[PDB]
Each structure stands twice: as structure tokens, then as C-alpha cells.
Amino acid sequence: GDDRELAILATAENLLEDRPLADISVDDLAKGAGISRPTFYFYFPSKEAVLLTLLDRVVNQADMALQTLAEDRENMWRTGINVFFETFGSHKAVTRAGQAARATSVEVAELWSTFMQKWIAYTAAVIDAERDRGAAPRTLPAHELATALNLMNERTLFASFAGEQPSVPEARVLDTLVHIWVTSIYGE
Amino acid sequence: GDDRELAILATAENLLEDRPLADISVDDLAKGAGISRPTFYFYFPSKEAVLLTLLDRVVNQADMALQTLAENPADTDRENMWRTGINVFFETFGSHKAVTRAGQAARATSVEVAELWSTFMQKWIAYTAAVIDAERDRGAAPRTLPAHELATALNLMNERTLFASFAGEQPSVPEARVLDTLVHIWVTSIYGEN
Numbered sequence: 001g002d003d004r005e006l007a008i009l010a011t012a013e014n015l016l017e018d019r020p021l022a023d024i025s026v027d028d029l030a031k032g033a034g035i036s037r038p039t040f041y042f043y044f045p046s047k048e049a050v051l052l053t054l055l056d057r058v059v060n061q062a063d064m065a066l067q068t069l070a071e072d073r074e075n076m077w078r079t080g081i082n083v084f085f086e087t088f089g090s091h092k093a094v095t096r097a098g099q100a101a102r103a104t105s106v107e108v109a110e111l112w113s114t115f116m117q118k119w120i121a122y123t124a125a126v127i128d129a130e131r132d133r134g135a136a137p138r139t140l141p142a143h144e145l146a147t148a149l150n151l152m153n154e155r156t157l158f159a160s161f162a163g164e165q166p167s168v169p170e171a172r173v174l175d176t177l178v179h180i181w182v183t184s185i186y187g188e
Numbered sequence: 189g190d191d192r193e194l195a196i197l198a199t200a201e202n203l204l205e206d207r208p209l210a211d212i213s214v215d216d217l218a219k220g221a222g223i224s225r226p227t228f229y230f231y232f233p234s235k236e237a238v239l240l241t242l243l244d245r246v247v248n249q250a251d252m253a254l255q256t257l258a259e260n261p262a263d264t265d266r267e268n269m270w271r272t273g274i275n276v277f278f279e280t281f282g283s284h285k286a287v288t289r290a291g292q293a294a295r296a297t298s299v300e301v302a303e304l305w306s307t308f309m310q311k312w313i314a315y316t317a318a319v320i321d322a323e324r325d326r327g328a329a330p331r332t333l334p335a336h337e338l339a340t341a342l343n344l345m346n347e348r349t350l351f352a353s354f355a356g357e358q359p360s361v362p363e364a365r366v367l368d369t370l371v372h373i374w375v376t377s378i379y380g381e382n
């Protein structure tokens with residue numbers, strides 16, 4: 001029933017650890033899920049739709065975790081960046097394949113865009129509240145500062161996870177981001 | 189002869205303004221450059237090699253311009269020094285948006301493009317780190333993060349942020365605000381004690 005959908009998703013994430021989406025066939029996903037190819041087509045219209053569902057789940061998991069946190073200043077930001085570091089860090093294969101699919105899937109590009117706008121708006125609201133209580137100085141427009149900081153974390157977190165040359169080592173990427181966020185949000 | 193190569197490059201950059209590489213054929217590039225298809229193949233093995241060459245020229249132009257800046261005293265306050273350096277990339281890539289966009293896309297599918305980008309990123313990060321170290325050495329910047337790791341995150345920020353702005357991504361910093369936004373983050377993060 002639903003456990004069949006879940007088996008297809010788990011198979012896909014498992015195979016994506018090994019190869020790109022280009023080198024995984026519906027036949028591949030059907031076999032690992034223990035179903036036939038036409039049964040697979042009952043649950044998903046394409047291998048692309050499988051990835052989109054995985055990414056949606058990972059992105060919603062980071063988002064929910066950030067809402068949970070939301071509901072010292074350096075430590076507050078570190079805890080928030082850490083939600084993304086851990087969530088996407090725990091699903092590296094999906095992260096890497098989802099980021100690649102942005103260039104070829106409008107639904108993936110729109111999903112990413114929607115959540116980026118949400119995370120940027122949350123970041124700017126917190127900066128504004130810090131400015132309101134007199135802990136942060138009124139320097140750049142908060143939304144513009146939030147946008148560049150979130151774009152930084154996207155590129156840098158994901159370069160690290162994929163082992164890009166160049167990238168910050170994964171064991172140093174959290175301290176690196178937190179320094180840049182704290183000095184740029186609080187720095188006069 | 190060489191003017192044929194340059195006409196093929198100019199044709200490709202022009203067509204990239206309106207359509208992606210996938211919607212440009214070799215026939216299109218030959219037609220715009222005033223040559224036949226087999227003549228095109230004399231100059232380039234593929235439409236991919238044309239783009240790789242365009243990107244190589246753009247990336248080398250930014251790089252030569254950063255070298256020119258670096259070799260001057262250029263005496264200026266610290267914020268102004270970083271602004272002038274970020275401005276080289278803002279102007280150079282900003283002047284070739286279609287090539288920048290297509291070349292960033294082609295990183296996914298071309299090992300030669302991926303390796304080109306990677307080579308210059310490492311060079312620009314190393315120059316940034318060396319400048320941060322010299323600043324630390326003279327006592328203008330505090331010793332906070334490892335200079336190379338700070339340099340890496342800052343350059344990766346500029347790559348994603350400049351290129352999101354150029355492409356009009358949602359979300360992105362408006363192109364008229366992006367220079368000021370980057371310079372603020374570089375200055376506070378390089379000089380900020382906290």
C-alpha cells in the first residue's frame with residue numbers, strides 16, 4: 001500500500017548514494033522496492049517524480065526543525081545553521097541530486113525557490129527583531145543581508161557535502177558559517 | 189582564419205543571450221559566423237568546446253584584471269580595497285551574463301568546464317587568503333578563523349550571490365544592491381573581532 005511508496009523512496013535514496021539519477025532506471029527502483037515496473041508507475045509517473053518527493057521530504061524536515069527552534073546570540077545562530085547542516089548532511093545523496101535537478105526540473109527549481117524565500121524571510125525577521133531590541137546595528141537592509149547569507153550557506157554547505165574542490169572541510173563548515181553570520185549581523 | 193574563430197565565438201555569445209546551449213545548433217553557429225558546418229568543425233570539435241572557450245576567455249579576463257589590481261599599491265581604505273576587488277568580478281561576469289549563466293550550467297555536464305572553474309576558484313581563494321594574512325600580519329585584521337577557510341566561504345558566497353543576481357533568480361539580491369551587500373559581509377567578517 002503506502003509501505004510500497006516508502007520502499008520506492010528508500011530504494012531511490014539508497015541508489016543515489018552510488019550513482020546519479022541518470023544511471024538509475026525505473027526497473028532499478030522497482031526491483032529494490034520488490035514490485036513490477038507497471039506497479040511502480042501506479043505510485044510515481046517517473047524517476048524524476050521520485051527525486052522530487054525525496055527532496056520535498058528533506059526540505060520539509062529542515063523547515064519543520066527550524067519552526068521548532070523558532071517557537072547567547074552566536075549560539076542562537078549556530079543552532080539555526082545546525083538544523084540545515086544536520087538535516088541536509090544526513091541526506092547527502094538526495095541533496096546533491098536535488099540541487100542538480102534544479103537545472104532540468106521546473107518543479108524542483110520552484111520547490112527550492114519557495115523554501116529559500118521562506119528561510120530568507122525568517123532570517124530577516126530575526127535580524128529585524130535583533131535590530132529592534134538594540135542588539136544589532138542598522139547596517140544593510142535586513143532582507144538583502146539575509147538573502148546573501150542564505151545563498152552563502154546553500155553553496156558552501158553543499159560544496160562541503162559533495163567534497164568539491166574547493167570547499168571548506170565538513171568538520172569546519174559550521175564554525176566558518178557562524179563566524180560570517182555573527183560578524184555580518186552584529187558588526188558595525 | 190582567426191577572424192573565423194572570433195566570429196564563431198561572437199555568434200555563440202550572441203545566441204546564448206536568447207536561448208540555452210541546447211537550443212543552439214552547430215548549423216546556427218556556422219550560419220552566424222558566415223561559414224559552412226564542416227568549416228566550423230575545423231575550428232571546434234563541438235558547440236560545447238565553443239562555450240568552454242568563451243568561459244575560458246571570460247574567466248581569464250577577470251583573473252588578469254584581479255592581477256592588475258594586486259600589483260598596484262592602489263592606496264585606499266580597507267573597505268574600498270575589497271570593494272574594488274569584488275567589483276572586478278561583478279563587472280567582468282556582469283558584462284558577459286549569457287556566458288556566465290551557460291558556463292555555470294555546463295559545470296554539471298562538462299568535466300573540462302568543471303575543472304576550469306575549480307582551477308580559478310582555487311587561485312582566487314588563495315589570493316584572498318594571502319591578502320587576509322597580510323592584513324593580519326600588519327595588525328589591521330584579527331586572527332579569528334583560518335584565513336583559507338574564511339576565504340573559501342566568502343568566494344563561494346560571491347559565486348552564488350553574483351550569479352543568482354545576474355540571472356534574476358528568485359530569490360536574489362537586486363543587481364544594483366549586490367556590490368554593497370557583498371562588501372559589507374567581506375569587511376565585517378575579515379575585520380570583525382566579533
Ligand SMILES: CC(C)CCC(=O)N1CCC(c2nc(-c3cccs3)no2)CC1
Nearest residue numbers: 070076080081084119122123126153154
Ligand atoms: C539555505 C539553507 C541551505 C540553509 C539555511 C540556513 O543555514 N539558515 C536559514 C535560517 C536560519 C535562521 N535561524 C533562525 C533562528 C531562530 C531561532 C533560533 S535560530 N532564524 O533564521 C539559520 C541559517
Ligand SMILES: CC(C)CCC(=O)N1CCC(c2nc(-c3cccs3)no2)CC1
Nearest residue numbers: 269273274277312315316319343346347
Ligand atoms: C568566485 C568569484 C566570483 C569571486 C570573485 C571575488 O569577488 N573576489 C575574489 C578575490 C578578491 C580579492 N581581491 C583582492 C585584492 C587585492 C588588492 C586589491 S583587491 N584580493 O582577493 C575579491 C573578491
